Amino acid sequence: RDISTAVVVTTISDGGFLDRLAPALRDAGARLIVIPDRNTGPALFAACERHRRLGLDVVCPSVAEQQDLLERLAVPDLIPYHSDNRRNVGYLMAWMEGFDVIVSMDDDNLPTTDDFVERHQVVCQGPRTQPVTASSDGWFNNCALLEVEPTEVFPRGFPFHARPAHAQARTSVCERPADVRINAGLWLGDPDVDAITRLAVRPNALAHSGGSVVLAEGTWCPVNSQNTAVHRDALPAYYFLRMGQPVDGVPMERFGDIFSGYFVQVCAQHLGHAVRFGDPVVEHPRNEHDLLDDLHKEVPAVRLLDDILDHLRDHPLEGGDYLETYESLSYALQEIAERVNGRAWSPDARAFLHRSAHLMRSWTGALRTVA
Amino acid sequence: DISTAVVVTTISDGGFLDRLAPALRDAGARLIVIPDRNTGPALFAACERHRRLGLDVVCPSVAEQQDLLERLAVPDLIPYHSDNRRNVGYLMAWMEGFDVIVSMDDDNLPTTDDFVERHQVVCQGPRTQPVTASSDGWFNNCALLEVEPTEVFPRGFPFHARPAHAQARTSVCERPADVRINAGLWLGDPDVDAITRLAVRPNALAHSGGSVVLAEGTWCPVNSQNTAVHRDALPAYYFLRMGQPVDGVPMERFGDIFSGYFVQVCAQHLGHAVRFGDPVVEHPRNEHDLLDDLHKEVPAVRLLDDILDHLRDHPLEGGDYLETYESLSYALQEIAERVNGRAWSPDARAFLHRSAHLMRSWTGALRTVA
Amino acid sequence: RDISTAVVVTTISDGGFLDRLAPALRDAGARLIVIPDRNTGPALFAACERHRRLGLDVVCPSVAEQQDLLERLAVPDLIPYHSDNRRNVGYLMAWMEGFDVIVSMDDDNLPTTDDFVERHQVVCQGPRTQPVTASSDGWFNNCALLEVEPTEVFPRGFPFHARPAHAQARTSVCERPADVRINAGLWLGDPDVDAITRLAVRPNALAHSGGSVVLAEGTWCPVNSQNTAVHRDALPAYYFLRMGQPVDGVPMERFGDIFSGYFVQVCAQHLGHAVRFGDPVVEHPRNEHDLLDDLHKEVPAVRLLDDILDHLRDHPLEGGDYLETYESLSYALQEIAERVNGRAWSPDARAFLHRSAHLMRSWTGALRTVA
Amino acid sequence: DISTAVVVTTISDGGFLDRLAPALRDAGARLIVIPDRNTGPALFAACERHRRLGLDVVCPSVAEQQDLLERLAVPDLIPYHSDNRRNVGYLMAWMEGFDVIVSMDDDNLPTTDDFVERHQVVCQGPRTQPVTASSDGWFNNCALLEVEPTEVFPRGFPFHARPAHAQARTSVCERPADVRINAGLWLGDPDVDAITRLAVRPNALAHSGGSVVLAEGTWCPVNSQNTAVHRDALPAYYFLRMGQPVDGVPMERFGDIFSGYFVQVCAQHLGHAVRFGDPVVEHPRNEHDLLDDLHKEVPAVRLLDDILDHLRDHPLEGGDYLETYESLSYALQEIAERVNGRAWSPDARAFLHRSAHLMRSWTGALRTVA
Ligand SMILES: Nc1nc2c(ncn2[C@@H]2O[C@H](COP(=O)(O)OP(=O)(O)O)[C@@H](O)[C@H]2O)c(=O)[nH]1
Ligand SMILES: Nc1nc2c(ncn2[C@@H]2O[C@H](COP(=O)(O)OP(=O)(O)O)[C@@H](O)[C@H]2O)c(=O)[nH]1
Ligand SMILES: Nc1nc2c(ncn2[C@@H]2O[C@H](COP(=O)(O)OP(=O)(O)O)[C@@H](O)[C@H]2O)c(=O)[nH]1
Ligand SMILES: Nc1nc2c(ncn2[C@@H]2O[C@H](COP(=O)(O)OP(=O)(O)O)[C@@H](O)[C@H]2O)c(=O)[nH]1
Ligand SMILES: [Mn+2]
Ligand SMILES: [Mn+2]
Ligand SMILES: [Mn+2]
Ligand SMILES: [Mn+2]
């Protein structure tokens, strides 16, 4: 087989997270691509060099090396600094180097099992007739696969309009052909919920009790970039969306992977591919966060997400591969930006989609340059 | 001979009077309905219909309201197209000398026949009674209810205190207390913030914890949905004017959050107390875009924890509620300059300064009629 | 010859301006297209019907008729209501009806001479070797053609960075081939200056003393939509830009024709065509304006205009006609939006260009539908 | 024996002292240089160099400034990274008992040897003298200069009064007056707003109109670039804190526009007057992004006309400048609620309320040292 895996992590830490992250990746021979930023100290580079001598295929390109690559691809202004958007550099590097699997992780996610890399290789099994999970309302709650206290929760990016009636939705499973290209692993401890839910019930994920599922066409669930494997064919549609666009004068943040998770998902289903949820599960002791500041950052995107998701269901895409389908998606977002209505759809909210669509096509143009 | 006046501001057609009048009419209480510019003519016909049925109801037109406010040299204090107009009802009940002022919304219905009698507890006077204290200085009134699917906190409860509140020690002992504010509870949709409602959509099944009187140093937010205020404490119960931007985002839905805390801090300075529990109302809350509620509440939520912490460091002065409320207004202006944090932009600080002026404009009008 | 002219005016007035505007248009047989809005009272329709019986070819389509046409062209959300942007409806109608000349006017511009329509027909003379005016700094001040008190002024939309050194620029005239397709007539009384200049010196235009000029390639001057003739071939690039986009949280306004005037100008010079300034001159008793409110509306666009104009000079366009060249221009604006730098270039400022570019291509798509 | 203290706040390297020290050193005046956090160490070396040459110059570090402001219970009054820090120099000169406080910028250079002597006019006391009045209530000080290419108005002059000002009647007659503020004029780049500078780029060639003393009811903006204030009037000369948003846009560059009008309205209430004319300085203004200046000035320009009109309707109270300035602060809070217009959003009104508190915080600090 010889399935190559590259893990992508962007960080501003001192590199101490490598002590618990390297053994699972070293034993599998996977490559770790660490993306530092301008606000990243020199202790990270020393930590990578130490773990490299311990047998870890780790690379940590300086911002000078990153900017050289991005300048040669005619995209010097695509990826901003002082931002976790720089993980797109690791996406690009792994794709250029021909890795089969690109595993997006954060610097505070720790694998809980020895088969972490092997479980993420499921995005390489190809099309198979397999149990496929469908929902009557078109949504799946991946947090229902976990034991969560003190009450049930939905993942960050799950639409709010669908949450009340989701308990009455019918969940069915049947044997159908499917081609898994995205694998969203779950998380113990602090699950990936939005700031609203974390401020309200402070959820704690005890265990992974529901197994794994593969979602049918028409059944969606948000996908984050914290513990997610993407097959190299689907990576062109996995661009981490640039944040900072104001919605009614309030800049949005923390939703770069909410859009990327839905975008690669809509593109995958158009191409007959599927998204998987379940193992491998990581432990998430989330970084120290001002929850009221997280809330202030997430609300601008939360006010628009339900309308964007509804219009995406009514807009069929075109394309024969992920590059074409992602570009078709960018054009569909611009049409949605002018057709959608609501109090939150101020002129700057509509312009957010138009600028995002340009950046999406700037991302695809860079991939076409190396290809 | 205890007199009660119920204050409700509304833009509805008046249909809520059918289920609200019987409990008020049987007790002989006055209902003061405050219409707005966006209030249709059907409300006035509904008030006239229930008045002939024996209900002491008054519904002053916006012209009569503005004439009264001009005579008190406050023509710009209370805006239109806003539930801030309930302040007009507060003022009228106070001018007419009512003992109890019950603040209600047009979608709260009493569940018992003794609704008015239970709210009269703000007239009992000082006596040694069971008083509830908390080690962290906060009491969760929603813990007095059976709520599904999980425990919630009331709207306006500080967020920094919520995680460690489960480990707080709650104690009760016989101490002198003088109840001047009675916040009645609510079944159905409880008064939680938009954050909690978006997350768990709570449902209040029953009132199971009884009633409590909070000790000095133990606080809990008081809303204006089902709350009796004794006439002495009414000057400090001014409904705060919303619309001030915090980082360019105008705040809303927290006018009674500040008023409930302000009357509470003033009452404890004067040796008075706040009660929580009965009488309980049924709350089928009006339709609400919850994401819009969230957008309206976040600006105030970002400042409330800091404001509450500083209010504990600032001793007040005053011999009555008018003097203590004015002393509070000056305390807010000092806090506005000493507080620090990411959310404390120049417009956030200026929000406290303009609020302080409006508080003293409210007290100035009360001193005019008095 | 038989040169057909259609005058386009959008208004919310009662139609009294027709008493002094109709005779100059009736005597020339030109068509007047009045574009009402939702905030336009019924007295305007009665005024048009009265002048129609007096011999004026005037049409005043209701907003129901306008929305029907725009819906059939698959652009129901392009043109907003309660906005002078609705003059685009008159642009479209005149273009559909095959008029040679489209004269954009406001409801407070009155022709001062009997040859008003004939002078605007200059955009139909075709290519000729004629005196062409060039400037060493690349800018021409059309207000220098007027007698203005109490001091010299620049027109609204003239870049501010070029104003100090413009007095040292060399102006030269020589016989060169040129093809005039846009004719910007001048204005007496209150000239078209920005709110900054009007608040500062309150200029008064006494007379037109400088004659007319035809600008060379590389020499630019802003063109407004108050007294401007556009040949039907160049009209596709004359779309009135939609205002309301925030710049640092402040919505821009009053610059819809500043962008359209520069856009049709850049497109015309790419196609070897030219812009003319001078006669016919109108009288402008400007409507009552809160000058401080005009200032508050214009500053957001003024903060970006100099940078946009500078980058447009460094970006060569493509296209064989105005439709292709305008679409090429829209793509160039999106590249400029990401390359430009400055304190005023917040995320919403950059997104203003991206949404404008989409609306420009939505405009061209509607023209391609009728064509 | 009249003592003069010059107040300059700067972030430069101190090179401006070479052309500023001779006129100040020959007069024995004190120069109080106020550095900021963004001030390099070269300024302190330049002050020490000119001190050995005979100049009475002091340059307190930010630590010494903050220690003094803590002792006066105003640690949060004056922000850093702002020319608002000139208020520290105002305070120090007032504490040290100087008769004349001359407010200057680090790019204003005296053109004559009698610069300090001319500014001493704020010490002459009351006397019958030629006093200039205007029928519209405004005087254009730039009309005292030869300006090209066209006539301009000073920064802070109201815009609604500019068109009809040419028809205003200007008269002069012998009346008692007591000059307490002397605004010296400026050659080169005159003090116009960004609107005027962007439009005509004025150049002031000479001072040709002499000097004038304005009558009661005739106003003209006073800046802090070349202005002497008598120590009695100094309490009302507090440099207003900028940064408050007006419709989400923070205001700047108008701190001395409000201070110049505030000290002026206070002075006339106490029977004192403002003088315009000599001594004139040369102004090679520092580099400025003019479109950025415009963006900073528009928020204040949108409110100034309304504020000035209402200040004429509001009689002040007070026996000295401290009491009159505090009375002015309360007048601003009443205006903030009575004024109407498109630019008067909630944050615009709250701007006046926070400014009023800061004014009383300034006066409270002065009452502490006194
Ligand atoms: N390059 C870069 N990465 C950042 C920056 N700030 C945070 N990150 C990374 O972003 C990743 C995800 O952030 P995290 O706090 O775990 O997200 P959350 O758990 O969903 O709230 C972490 O691995 C951080 O190291 C930054 O300024 N630059
Ligand atoms: N005067 C006035 N009252 C209003 C307006 N809008 C709402 N209200 C009243 O405000 C009261 C409280 O509102 P409500 O929706 O019950 O608040 P919630 O239950 O906490 O979400 C209701 O009784 C309404 O009648 C308005 O525009 N003007
Ligand atoms: N359709 C429409 N036209 C408008 C509206 N407001 C103004 N106009 C028109 O816009 C045109 C130009 O406005 P004008 O005040 O003359 O611009 P200015 O002289 O450059 O300041 C006028 O003919 C107005 O009739 C509106 O709300 N809707
Ligand atoms: N303390 C302090 N002073 C400053 C700062 N920026 C500017 N200044 C001072 O403010 C004074 C007036 O500024 P200036 O550019 O001359 O204003 P203008 O001539 O009206 O445009 C100058 O003397 C500067 O030294 C700052 O960040 N901190
Ligand atoms: Mn994390
Ligand atoms: Mn309610
Ligand atoms: Mn006009
Ligand atoms: Mn200066």
PDB file of N, CA, C and O and ligand atoms in Angstrom, chain C residues 9-13 35-40 81-87 105-109 156 192-193 198 226 254 257 284 286-289 294 298, ligand 3:
ATOM      1  N   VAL C   9     -33.017  60.686 -16.837  1.00  0.00           N
ATOM      2  CA  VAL C   9     -33.118  61.430 -15.588  1.00  0.00           C
ATOM      3  C   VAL C   9     -33.889  60.581 -14.588  1.00  0.00           C
ATOM      4  O   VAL C   9     -34.988  60.106 -14.889  1.00  0.00           O
ATOM      5  N   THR C  10     -33.311  60.376 -13.409  1.00  0.00           N
ATOM      6  CA  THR C  10     -34.013  59.758 -12.296  1.00  0.00           C
ATOM      7  C   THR C  10     -34.323  60.835 -11.265  1.00  0.00           C
ATOM      8  O   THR C  10     -33.505  61.728 -11.021  1.00  0.00           O
ATOM      9  N   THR C  11     -35.521  60.776 -10.688  1.00  0.00           N
ATOM     10  CA  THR C  11     -35.963  61.875  -9.844  1.00  0.00           C
ATOM     11  C   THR C  11     -37.032  61.401  -8.872  1.00  0.00           C
ATOM     12  O   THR C  11     -37.735  60.420  -9.122  1.00  0.00           O
ATOM     13  N   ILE C  12     -37.132  62.119  -7.755  1.00  0.00           N
ATOM     14  CA  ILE C  12     -38.211  61.977  -6.790  1.00  0.00           C
ATOM     15  C   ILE C  12     -39.008  63.266  -6.647  1.00  0.00           C
ATOM     16  O   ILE C  12     -39.777  63.414  -5.697  1.00  0.00           O
ATOM     17  N   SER C  13     -38.832  64.206  -7.574  1.00  0.00           N
ATOM     18  CA  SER C  13     -39.513  65.488  -7.526  1.00  0.00           C
ATOM     19  C   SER C  13     -40.927  65.362  -8.088  1.00  0.00           C
ATOM     20  O   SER C  13     -41.362  64.295  -8.532  1.00  0.00           O
ATOM     21  N   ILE C  35     -36.937  58.176 -14.716  1.00  0.00           N
ATOM     22  CA  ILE C  35     -36.944  56.980 -13.876  1.00  0.00           C
ATOM     23  C   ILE C  35     -37.429  57.347 -12.480  1.00  0.00           C
ATOM     24  O   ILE C  35     -36.656  57.890 -11.676  1.00  0.00           O
ATOM     25  N   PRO C  36     -38.686  57.077 -12.146  1.00  0.00           N
ATOM     26  CA  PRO C  36     -39.162  57.322 -10.784  1.00  0.00           C
ATOM     27  C   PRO C  36     -38.713  56.210  -9.845  1.00  0.00           C
ATOM     28  O   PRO C  36     -38.169  55.186 -10.256  1.00  0.00           O
ATOM     29  N   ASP C  37     -38.956  56.435  -8.557  1.00  0.00           N
ATOM     30  CA  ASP C  37     -38.591  55.492  -7.514  1.00  0.00           C
ATOM     31  C   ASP C  37     -39.823  55.202  -6.662  1.00  0.00           C
ATOM     32  O   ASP C  37     -40.913  55.720  -6.916  1.00  0.00           O
ATOM     33  N   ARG C  38     -39.646  54.357  -5.644  1.00  0.00           N
ATOM     34  CA  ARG C  38     -40.754  54.071  -4.739  1.00  0.00           C
ATOM     35  C   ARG C  38     -41.127  55.289  -3.903  1.00  0.00           C
ATOM     36  O   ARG C  38     -42.288  55.433  -3.505  1.00  0.00           O
ATOM     37  N   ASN C  39     -40.166  56.173  -3.631  1.00  0.00           N
ATOM     38  CA  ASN C  39     -40.423  57.401  -2.894  1.00  0.00           C
ATOM     39  C   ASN C  39     -40.771  58.572  -3.808  1.00  0.00           C
ATOM     40  O   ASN C  39     -40.591  59.730  -3.413  1.00  0.00           O
ATOM     41  N   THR C  40     -41.270  58.298  -5.012  1.00  0.00           N
ATOM     42  CA  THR C  40     -41.665  59.334  -5.958  1.00  0.00           C
ATOM     43  C   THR C  40     -43.186  59.424  -5.994  1.00  0.00           C
ATOM     44  O   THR C  40     -43.866  58.422  -6.238  1.00  0.00           O
ATOM     45  N   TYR C  81     -33.770  50.216  -4.674  1.00  0.00           N
ATOM     46  CA  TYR C  81     -34.774  51.265  -4.618  1.00  0.00           C
ATOM     47  C   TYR C  81     -34.382  52.308  -3.577  1.00  0.00           C
ATOM     48  O   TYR C  81     -33.451  52.118  -2.790  1.00  0.00           O
ATOM     49  N   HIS C  82     -35.106  53.430  -3.592  1.00  0.00           N
ATOM     50  CA  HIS C  82     -34.795  54.585  -2.746  1.00  0.00           C
ATOM     51  C   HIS C  82     -33.362  55.060  -2.976  1.00  0.00           C
ATOM     52  O   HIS C  82     -32.622  55.347  -2.034  1.00  0.00           O
ATOM     53  N   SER C  83     -32.968  55.142  -4.246  1.00  0.00           N
ATOM     54  CA  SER C  83     -31.592  55.458  -4.599  1.00  0.00           C
ATOM     55  C   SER C  83     -31.553  56.003  -6.019  1.00  0.00           C
ATOM     56  O   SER C  83     -32.290  55.531  -6.888  1.00  0.00           O
ATOM     57  N   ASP C  84     -30.681  56.988  -6.248  1.00  0.00           N
ATOM     58  CA  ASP C  84     -30.478  57.485  -7.605  1.00  0.00           C
ATOM     59  C   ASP C  84     -29.706  56.503  -8.474  1.00  0.00           C
ATOM     60  O   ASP C  84     -29.430  56.813  -9.638  1.00  0.00           O
ATOM     61  N   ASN C  85     -29.353  55.333  -7.933  1.00  0.00           N
ATOM     62  CA  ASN C  85     -28.809  54.251  -8.742  1.00  0.00           C
ATOM     63  C   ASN C  85     -29.797  53.779  -9.800  1.00  0.00           C
ATOM     64  O   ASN C  85     -29.389  53.141 -10.776  1.00  0.00           O
ATOM     65  N   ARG C  86     -31.087  54.085  -9.631  1.00  0.00           N
ATOM     66  CA  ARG C  86     -32.104  53.656 -10.583  1.00  0.00           C
ATOM     67  C   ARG C  86     -31.937  54.288 -11.956  1.00  0.00           C
ATOM     68  O   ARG C  86     -32.614  53.860 -12.898  1.00  0.00           O
ATOM     69  N   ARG C  87     -31.062  55.287 -12.101  1.00  0.00           N
ATOM     70  CA  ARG C  87     -30.783  55.824 -13.427  1.00  0.00           C
ATOM     71  C   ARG C  87     -30.203  54.764 -14.354  1.00  0.00           C
ATOM     72  O   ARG C  87     -30.257  54.930 -15.577  1.00  0.00           O
ATOM     73  N   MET C 105     -28.515  63.091 -17.215  1.00  0.00           N
ATOM     74  CA  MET C 105     -28.762  64.376 -16.579  1.00  0.00           C
ATOM     75  C   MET C 105     -29.428  64.166 -15.228  1.00  0.00           C
ATOM     76  O   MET C 105     -29.987  63.105 -14.941  1.00  0.00           O
ATOM     77  N   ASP C 106     -29.358  65.200 -14.398  1.00  0.00           N
ATOM     78  CA  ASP C 106     -30.103  65.261 -13.151  1.00  0.00           C
ATOM     79  C   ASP C 106     -31.295  66.196 -13.311  1.00  0.00           C
ATOM     80  O   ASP C 106     -31.359  67.007 -14.238  1.00  0.00           O
ATOM     81  N   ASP C 107     -32.248  66.076 -12.383  1.00  0.00           N
ATOM     82  CA  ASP C 107     -33.479  66.853 -12.473  1.00  0.00           C
ATOM     83  C   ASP C 107     -33.288  68.324 -12.122  1.00  0.00           C
ATOM     84  O   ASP C 107     -34.274  69.069 -12.121  1.00  0.00           O
ATOM     85  N   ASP C 108     -32.065  68.760 -11.817  1.00  0.00           N
ATOM     86  CA  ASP C 108     -31.794  70.162 -11.522  1.00  0.00           C
ATOM     87  C   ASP C 108     -30.741  70.748 -12.457  1.00  0.00           C
ATOM     88  O   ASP C 108     -30.081  71.730 -12.103  1.00  0.00           O
ATOM     89  N   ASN C 109     -30.563  70.160 -13.635  1.00  0.00           N
ATOM     90  CA  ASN C 109     -29.668  70.677 -14.662  1.00  0.00           C
ATOM     91  C   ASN C 109     -30.513  71.197 -15.816  1.00  0.00           C
ATOM     92  O   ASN C 109     -31.335  70.458 -16.367  1.00  0.00           O
ATOM     93  N   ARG C 156     -15.286  67.385  -8.480  1.00  0.00           N
ATOM     94  CA  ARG C 156     -15.518  66.241  -7.608  1.00  0.00           C
ATOM     95  C   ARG C 156     -14.930  64.981  -8.234  1.00  0.00           C
ATOM     96  O   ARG C 156     -15.121  64.717  -9.424  1.00  0.00           O
ATOM     97  N   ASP C 192     -19.645  71.221 -10.135  1.00  0.00           N
ATOM     98  CA  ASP C 192     -19.574  69.893  -9.527  1.00  0.00           C
ATOM     99  C   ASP C 192     -18.225  69.741  -8.830  1.00  0.00           C
ATOM    100  O   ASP C 192     -17.265  69.176  -9.359  1.00  0.00           O
ATOM    101  N   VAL C 193     -18.159  70.264  -7.610  1.00  0.00           N
ATOM    102  CA  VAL C 193     -17.013  70.061  -6.739  1.00  0.00           C
ATOM    103  C   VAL C 193     -17.439  69.132  -5.610  1.00  0.00           C
ATOM    104  O   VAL C 193     -18.627  68.902  -5.369  1.00  0.00           O
ATOM    105  N   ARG C 198     -16.740  72.621  -1.586  1.00  0.00           N
ATOM    106  CA  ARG C 198     -17.935  73.444  -1.420  1.00  0.00           C
ATOM    107  C   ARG C 198     -18.022  74.009  -0.006  1.00  0.00           C
ATOM    108  O   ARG C 198     -18.426  75.162   0.184  1.00  0.00           O
ATOM    109  N   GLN C 226     -24.181  64.137 -14.534  1.00  0.00           N
ATOM    110  CA  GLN C 226     -25.097  65.265 -14.415  1.00  0.00           C
ATOM    111  C   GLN C 226     -25.380  65.945 -15.747  1.00  0.00           C
ATOM    112  O   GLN C 226     -26.450  66.542 -15.915  1.00  0.00           O
ATOM    113  N   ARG C 254     -22.553  59.213  -2.932  1.00  0.00           N
ATOM    114  CA  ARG C 254     -22.341  60.348  -3.829  1.00  0.00           C
ATOM    115  C   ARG C 254     -21.194  60.143  -4.811  1.00  0.00           C
ATOM    116  O   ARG C 254     -20.782  61.103  -5.474  1.00  0.00           O
ATOM    117  N   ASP C 257     -21.163  58.003  -9.816  1.00  0.00           N
ATOM    118  CA  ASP C 257     -20.725  58.464 -11.126  1.00  0.00           C
ATOM    119  C   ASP C 257     -19.240  58.798 -11.176  1.00  0.00           C
ATOM    120  O   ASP C 257     -18.681  58.899 -12.274  1.00  0.00           O
ATOM    121  N   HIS C 284     -26.797  74.957 -13.110  1.00  0.00           N
ATOM    122  CA  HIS C 284     -26.965  74.048 -11.976  1.00  0.00           C
ATOM    123  C   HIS C 284     -27.269  74.841 -10.712  1.00  0.00           C
ATOM    124  O   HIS C 284     -26.345  75.249  -9.991  1.00  0.00           O
ATOM    125  N   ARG C 286     -28.061  73.871  -7.563  1.00  0.00           N
ATOM    126  CA  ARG C 286     -28.032  72.578  -6.894  1.00  0.00           C
ATOM    127  C   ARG C 286     -29.125  72.481  -5.835  1.00  0.00           C
ATOM    128  O   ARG C 286     -29.484  73.466  -5.184  1.00  0.00           O
ATOM    129  N   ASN C 287     -29.666  71.272  -5.681  1.00  0.00           N
ATOM    130  CA  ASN C 287     -30.691  71.022  -4.679  1.00  0.00           C
ATOM    131  C   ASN C 287     -30.167  71.338  -3.282  1.00  0.00           C
ATOM    132  O   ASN C 287     -28.958  71.363  -3.029  1.00  0.00           O
ATOM    133  N   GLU C 288     -31.101  71.586  -2.367  1.00  0.00           N
ATOM    134  CA  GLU C 288     -30.748  71.892  -0.987  1.00  0.00           C
ATOM    135  C   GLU C 288     -30.021  70.709  -0.365  1.00  0.00           C
ATOM    136  O   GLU C 288     -30.545  69.591  -0.336  1.00  0.00           O
ATOM    137  N   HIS C 289     -28.808  70.953   0.128  1.00  0.00           N
ATOM    138  CA  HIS C 289     -27.956  69.894   0.649  1.00  0.00           C
ATOM    139  C   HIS C 289     -27.358  70.303   1.986  1.00  0.00           C
ATOM    140  O   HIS C 289     -26.848  71.419   2.131  1.00  0.00           O
ATOM    141  N   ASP C 294     -23.250  65.756   3.186  1.00  0.00           N
ATOM    142  CA  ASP C 294     -22.551  65.398   1.956  1.00  0.00           C
ATOM    143  C   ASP C 294     -21.107  65.015   2.241  1.00  0.00           C
ATOM    144  O   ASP C 294     -20.594  64.034   1.689  1.00  0.00           O
ATOM    145  N   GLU C 298     -19.181  61.464   1.432  1.00  0.00           N
ATOM    146  CA  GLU C 298     -18.141  61.390   0.411  1.00  0.00           C
ATOM    147  C   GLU C 298     -16.793  60.925   0.952  1.00  0.00           C
ATOM    148  O   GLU C 298     -16.034  60.281   0.215  1.00  0.00           O
TER     149      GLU C 298
HETATM  150  N1  LIG E   3     -34.614  57.398  -7.898  1.00  0.00           N
HETATM  151  C1  LIG E   3     -34.162  58.248  -6.944  1.00  0.00           C
HETATM  152  N2  LIG E   3     -33.501  59.365  -7.337  1.00  0.00           N
HETATM  153  C2  LIG E   3     -33.028  60.250  -6.429  1.00  0.00           C
HETATM  154  C3  LIG E   3     -33.237  59.983  -5.001  1.00  0.00           C
HETATM  155  N3  LIG E   3     -32.672  61.008  -4.334  1.00  0.00           N
HETATM  156  C4  LIG E   3     -32.144  61.857  -5.255  1.00  0.00           C
HETATM  157  N4  LIG E   3     -32.365  61.404  -6.504  1.00  0.00           N
HETATM  158  C5  LIG E   3     -31.942  62.036  -7.777  1.00  0.00           C
HETATM  159  O1  LIG E   3     -30.521  62.073  -7.914  1.00  0.00           O
HETATM  160  C6  LIG E   3     -30.193  63.124  -8.826  1.00  0.00           C
HETATM  161  C7  LIG E   3     -28.885  63.800  -8.444  1.00  0.00           C
HETATM  162  O2  LIG E   3     -28.960  64.337  -7.127  1.00  0.00           O
HETATM  163  P1  LIG E   3     -28.291  65.769  -6.819  1.00  0.00           P
HETATM  164  O3  LIG E   3     -28.727  66.271  -5.463  1.00  0.00           O
HETATM  165  O4  LIG E   3     -28.648  66.765  -7.896  1.00  0.00           O
HETATM  166  O5  LIG E   3     -26.714  65.441  -6.831  1.00  0.00           O
HETATM  167  P2  LIG E   3     -25.611  66.590  -6.587  1.00  0.00           P
HETATM  168  O6  LIG E   3     -26.081  67.891  -7.192  1.00  0.00           O
HETATM  169  O7  LIG E   3     -24.308  66.173  -7.228  1.00  0.00           O
HETATM  170  O8  LIG E   3     -25.395  66.769  -5.102  1.00  0.00           O
HETATM  171  C8  LIG E   3     -31.353  64.107  -8.795  1.00  0.00           C
HETATM  172  O9  LIG E   3     -31.904  64.232 -10.109  1.00  0.00           O
HETATM  173  C9  LIG E   3     -32.374  63.491  -7.860  1.00  0.00           C
HETATM  174  O10 LIG E   3     -33.697  63.616  -8.387  1.00  0.00           O
HETATM  175  C10 LIG E   3     -33.968  58.741  -4.649  1.00  0.00           C
HETATM  176  O11 LIG E   3     -34.189  58.439  -3.456  1.00  0.00           O
HETATM  177  N5  LIG E   3     -34.385  57.950  -5.648  1.00  0.00           N
END
